[PDB]
From a paper:
The short Argonaute-based bacterial defense system, SPARDA (Short Prokaryotic Argonaute and DNase/RNase-APAZ), utilizes guide RNA to target invading complementary DNA and exhibits collateral nuclease activity, leading to cell death or dormancy. In this study, we investigated the SPARDA system from Novosphingopyxis baekryungensis (NbaSPARDA) and discovered an unexpected filament configuration upon target DNA binding, which strongly correlated with collateral nuclease activity. Collectively, these experimental results led to a detailed working model of NbaSPARDA that highlights the importance of the transition in assembly form during the activation process. gRNA loading, tDNA engagement, and guide–target heteroduplex propagation lead to the “monomer-dimer-monomer-filament” transition of SPARDA complex.
The structure of the guide-bound complex, determined at 2.93 Å, showed that it is dimeric with the DREN domains being flexible. The guide-bound complex is predominantly dimerized, with the DREN domain missing from the cryo-EM density. The interactions responsible for NbaSPARDA dimerization occur at the APAZ–APAZ and Ago–Ago interfaces. At the APAZ–APAZ interface, F354.1 is sandwiched by Y261.2 and R260.2 to form π stacking interactions, while Q353.1 forms polar contact with R279.2, and Y349.1 forms π–π stacking interactions with Y349.2. At the Ago–Ago interface, R301.1 of NbaAgo.1 inserts into a polar pocket formed by a flexible loop (aa 168–178) of NbaAgo.2, and forms extensive contacts with the surrounding main chains and side chains of E268.2 and S174.2. Group alanine substitution of the interacting residues at the APAZ–APAZ interface or deletion of the flexible loop at the Ago–Ago interface disrupted the dimerization and mildly impaired the collateral nuclease activity, suggesting that the guide-induced dimerization plays a role in the process of SPARDA activation. The gRNA in the guide-bound complex is mostly flexible, except for the first five nucleotides, A1 to C5. Specifically, the 5′-phosphate group of gRNA and the phosphate group of A3 are coordinated via a magnesium ion, which facilitates the charged interactions between the 5′-phosphate groups and the side chains of K187, K240, and R183. The bulky nucleobase of A1 inserts into a hydrophobic pocket formed by W201, W159, and F182 and forms polar contact with the side chain of N181.
Numbering used by the authors:
A (entry chain A), C (entry chain B): 3 to 485
B (entry chain D), D (entry chain E): 161 to 186, 193 to 306, 318 to 382, 400 to 413
The structure:
RNA sequence: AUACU
RNA sequence: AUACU
């Protein structure tokens, strides 16, 4: 057949700079041009030791670390100072009073109970009360680094890996275990704090992680310069309200809505399939819009929005887009990682029909499907692998990298499905291009690898956070509360 | 120039399908050839080529054979017909090399059958450049296998072959007291091992399998 | 261990008469009380041949059939007439002009389509349309027979058995197949019509059933005397709203509430485990009260009532009891198909602490245990055998019968796991006796056998009917609309 | 007293458990006795009785054994502890008589082993009345089996056995092409054959199984 | 969906 | 839960 391998898209950095890796682009130009506040207060919550070495972490990278390794200088550039050349043009300032201690008795009392749910529940609740006591006044703690001691780390990790939780194909939330990260982000949704959760291995690799935690998580952290690259970027993302880099569309800019229809489960009542928009426009804002109970085919599995549910979902997505900008979406891109039912597709079409110059773009994605293609190697570019299989357009977007010199994976790449609906007025090539333009825009990392685009990748994060938000509570459409 | 192999087989089928109807839930052994299995559909009987007037297993009623071409029935748009036809193709593929290859329920594999204990057989197939052999009875017992999967792609019919190395367990015992031993051997270099295992697999060869496509351009 | 084998529960028949076989008690005494106003209109819906031979077959049994077989005269007594020897003493007459026709073209247009859902959908819609055109005026059709021709029979049965539906243990609705019975009873809930559904084999034993229907259902009718025993009893049960028999125990004669908590999925939205009460009092009235979206343990499986949900559900069961009779329950019995969670049990105790003198007891019944206790056989009684497993009361009620003279089953019996909760204030033998007392109150039958008591046997029927009742629609607590 | 047999097997256990904790999750082999089995709990390497200095096959941590009495861990109010003890007893039972009993992953059965093809090894055991023989090697090949389960029942640690015939597979042909031959012809009379097959299974007899209870009245 | 197992 | 496969 015809084999198509697309190139890397262009990410905008600073003021009119071309595309590199997210680290190298964020070293010569910095974040986007908007005159916001240059001060982010990074009030750390933990015990005395974690607050002390978090302050030592902030002090020791204000000059600059020069960690490196292996042979490729493109994969591991160093992380220089945070206060002299700094691309953010920002002060990473820590103030007294915001550094609130957790003593030692409370850490023992939350690390000694053998219940997996209850321990992470009190660990969430005590620090949520601490952040609430921070919110009353004194300063403006824009972010809050959540530093976890070794006992707390082991407790909240073994509450997850030893709870024997199960996974599901269409459940876009995770593996049913009590998640410290999702619970903290859910209970901090009413808070004004975009919080960041770290470990002390990120701070100092002098204390050993226990063997059970090492084996049950396959933990192998990077070097010193490689660990602060994905942390300070997440710190500037959360405490400013500005996205650091900007993606650039190709097939006409106009307006765009790459709404990632996914169906998470919320662990409040019936473990509903109440779904989420996870809308990402042409620039990258994560408009999260949960909806009502999506219908299921059988026994609460294989979800799909009903016709009325689909038009209500699309109507609130269009309402969010028209609230943020004074222009209706000229193109709506449904991205389901599952098959398209006829009722759901008809509802989405009927909702899109009341839109001028509309462009329905429906794509089927399915995980764990076995058909290996392009049986070659690294030399023939293997990242953007895609073959037109007479209709369906199977694609794996992870593999060998140009401009690297080596294959960063430790296993073989795995493909997904790319099958356009019959109502879609676009070929599989241009939808493949739009899938391979949703690239390098994850704000959880600075990598240039990808196996899930951000309406599909961000589905896991949205379902992680919205699992623990109860009924009748207003949720936030700002993406800073998720990753 | 930069073409590469494809893990599915372009099946070639004749103009004879022998549609029928039965009442069974899939085997009453048999008394002749090994093509007396319950290769049936979900409610009807979907047989294949046969040298007798009756269909396979001689259990379907007489004078209930449609005998229509492949293009009339096998090419449908609903996914249920594709799933039924591919399950039928897997059933008629598993019991096609029954004298040489066996099927195991876990991992969905057609492996080489052991003739004796401590086997030292070799499998040799010809090639244009040289002759390449394969040892598939290595004892340290494991043999070689593959897994079949479903694929149509509108114009044709395909069985997808996944060459599992089957390093874990072989022999008369179902499992060696749950003792696996495997690792990553294949690499993304200019050559590969899986495709190789696809190419040197020839025991699967009216299911006349065509050669895998291997036509690609990588500009 | 100690083994108790309890005796058969007795029933009240007629005016002050003891218990014989459920056909024999319904042959010498008749229904319970109030032998006045004996009018039942039995207006049939079907084609011309089906209505004609339905009336003909009613005319044959109006004199009395003398069918018999095998050797035991207790198992197969004959069916009496409908005149002076009629046990019901009721007018089993067809209403003139209520013979709603279905012609022939509509039957072929239902039986010709290849959709399993849609064929039974428009069959239900056609029957509902004729019933709505019947109940507008002219007479009072208290009951209706929905008599099905063979062409409709094969269609509505192969829509069920060839839909490849799945089953799960905690669901009582069935097997996700499109059920003609459940859909007809759900769409006839707003009507004043208790409706009886029969097959052409029940009317005339001259038309053959196709081999696919025979093999896919294992259909084997009994004789003519044994076929109308289970039909005219159900016909009189669904007319005038009067039960024909009741139990007579002496443990809880002040008040009793054997509320059979079960859970069903309704095929409208997410197939939510919206639960039901299925309350059966000391006489056997099936107060059906659907609850709310009960919490599940993981991914919508293993349902349990939340504490607020449990107290609300028990509160509306008590409200229904206090609406029907001027006395609050004092003997509320919970009968679950799964083990009691702590939250649900605590909610039930919190709800029942509001009530008066409490003799509350809770029992777990788990299906398919693997301990074949009492390997003795037929010459000792095997029906109603259980073993005190040092706290548990593992029980099977199916087995050999003393009055029948033979084992009526064709397979080995399989038991249930009777496990009292720790807050129950009664011994395991008393709870086993109370479960065994819920035997011969099945209005879907007229024989003496049990493997599930009617708070759990009726769970199947309630989840069958309430699977299709839509949201926001008032349901009926009368048990006539279920079996 | 019309006493009847129960299909549960009481366990008599010594006052030694050797609780330990090592990072392992399921079976290493090649050291000593076939008792090289990963008797693995939920995160703790809690094995059973230790004949040598180190438990199992010196895989566990030597300086972590507990050696507590039977009533400490075999008796527990938590259902999760009972399930873990049940799984540990099943793993000790399956790999105790593995020289002549095999285990299959489907239907969960411990069946009799076949030494070769066309087996003539019918099993004879002594009883109180006379010697009782059983055709456990019947060829037309099928053998005899049972499915095990464990639960506590608040006073002991009984093993429940379901005496099912094997009826399928065996070593002559891997899976007989998915074709069992059975009818379920059991008897409901003054006696039975399931009670029979429970009695004529003496092949599990440290996991010292007591006699099944059979203490009943049945008025 | 006449009933049970 | 600094990241990715
Ligand atoms: Mg992050
Ligand atoms: Mg009935």
């Amino acid at each position: 057949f015809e084999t198509r391998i697309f190139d890397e898209p262009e990410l905008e950095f600073g003021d009119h700079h071309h595309h590199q890796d997210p680290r190298l682009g964020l070293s010569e130009a910095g974040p986007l041009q908007t005159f916001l506040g240059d001060v982010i207060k990074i009030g750390v919550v933990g015990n005395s030791k974690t607050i002390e070495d978090t302050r030592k972490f902030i002090e020791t990278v204000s000059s600059g670390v020069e960690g490196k390794g292996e042979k490729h200088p493109n994969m591991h550039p160093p992380f220089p100072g945070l206060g002299n050349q700094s691309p953010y043009r920002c002060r990473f300032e820590i103030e007294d009073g915001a550094t609130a201690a957790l003593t030692k008795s409370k850490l023992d009392k939350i690390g000694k109970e053998p219940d997996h749910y209850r321990a992470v529940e009190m660990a969430v609740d005590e620090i949520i009360g601490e952040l609430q006591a921070m919110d009353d006044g004194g300063s403006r703690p824009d972010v809050a680094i959540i530093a976890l001691p070794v006992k707390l780390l082991e407790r909240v990790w073994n509450a997850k890996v030893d709870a024997r939780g199960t996974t599901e194909k269409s459940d876009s939330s995770g593996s049913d275990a009590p998640n410290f990260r999702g619970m903290l982000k859910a209970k901090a949704m009413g808070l004004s704090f975009p919080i960041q959760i770290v470990w002390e291995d990120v701070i100092d690799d002098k204390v050993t992680i226990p063997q059970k935690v090492k084996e049950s998580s396959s933990r192998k952290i990077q070097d010193i310069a490689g660990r602060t690259w994905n942390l300070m970027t997440s710190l500037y993302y959360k405490g400013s309200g500005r996205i650091p880099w900007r993606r650039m569309p190709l097939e006409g800019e106009f307006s765009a809505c790459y709404v990632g229809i996914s169906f998470y489960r919320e662990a409040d009542g019936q473990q509903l399939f109440t779904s989420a928009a996870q809308m990402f426009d042409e620039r990258g804002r994560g408009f999260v819009l949960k909806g009502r109970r999506a219908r299921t085919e059988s026994r609460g599995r294989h979800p799909y929005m009903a016709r009325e549910d689909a038009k209500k979902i699309i109507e609130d997505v269009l309402a969010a887009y028209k609230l943020h900008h004074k222009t209706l979406p000229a193109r709506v891109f449904i991205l389901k990682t599952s098959r398209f039912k006829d009722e759901e597709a008809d509802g989405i079409i009927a909702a899109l029909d009341e839109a001028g110059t509309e462009l329905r773009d429906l794509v089927w994605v399915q995980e764990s499907y076995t058909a290996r293609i392009l049986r070659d190697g690294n030399y023939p570019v293997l990242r953007g692998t895609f073959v037109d299989l007479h209709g369906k357009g199977l694609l794996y977007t992870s593999g060998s990298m140009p401009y690297y010199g080596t294959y960063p994976g430790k296993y073989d790449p795995n493909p997904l499905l790319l099958c356009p609906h019959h109502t879609s007025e676009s070929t599989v090539a241009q939808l493949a291009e739009e899938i391979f333009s949703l690239t390098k825009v994850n704000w959880n990392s600075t990598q240039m690898n990808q196996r899930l685009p951000i309406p599909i990748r961000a589905a896991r994060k949205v379902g992680e956070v919205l699992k623990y938000v109860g009924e009748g509570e207003v949720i936030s459409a700002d993406y800073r509360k998720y990753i | 120039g930069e073409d590469a192999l494809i893990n599915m087989l372009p099946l070639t089928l004749p103009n004879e399908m022998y549609i029928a109807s039965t009442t069974y839930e899939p085997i009453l052994n048999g008394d002749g050839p090994k093509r007396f299995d319950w290769v049936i559909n979900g409610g009807t009987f979907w047989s294949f080529h046969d040298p007798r007037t009756s269909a396979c297993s001689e259990i379907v009623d007489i004078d209930q054979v449609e005998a229509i071409n492949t293009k009339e029935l096998a090419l449908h748009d609903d996914i249920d017909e594709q799933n039924r036809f591919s399950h039928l193709l897997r059933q008629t593929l598993r019991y096609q090399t029954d004298s040489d290859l066996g099927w195991d329920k876990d991992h969905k594999a057609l492996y080489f059958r052991a003739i004796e204990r401590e086997v030292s057989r070799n499998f040799a197939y010809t090639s244009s450049k040289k002759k390449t052999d394969a040892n598939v009875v290595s004892v340290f017992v494991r043999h070689h296998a593959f897994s079949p999967r479903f694929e149509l792609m509108a114009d044709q019919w395909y069985l997808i072959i996944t060459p599992t190395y089957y390093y874990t367990t072989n022999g008369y015992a179902p499992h060696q007291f749950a003792a696996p031993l495997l690792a990553g051997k294949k690499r993304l270099d200019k050559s590969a091992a899986l495709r190789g295992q696809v190419i040197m697999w020839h025991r699967f060869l009216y299911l006349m399998f065509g050669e895998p496509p291997s036509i690609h351009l990588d500009v």
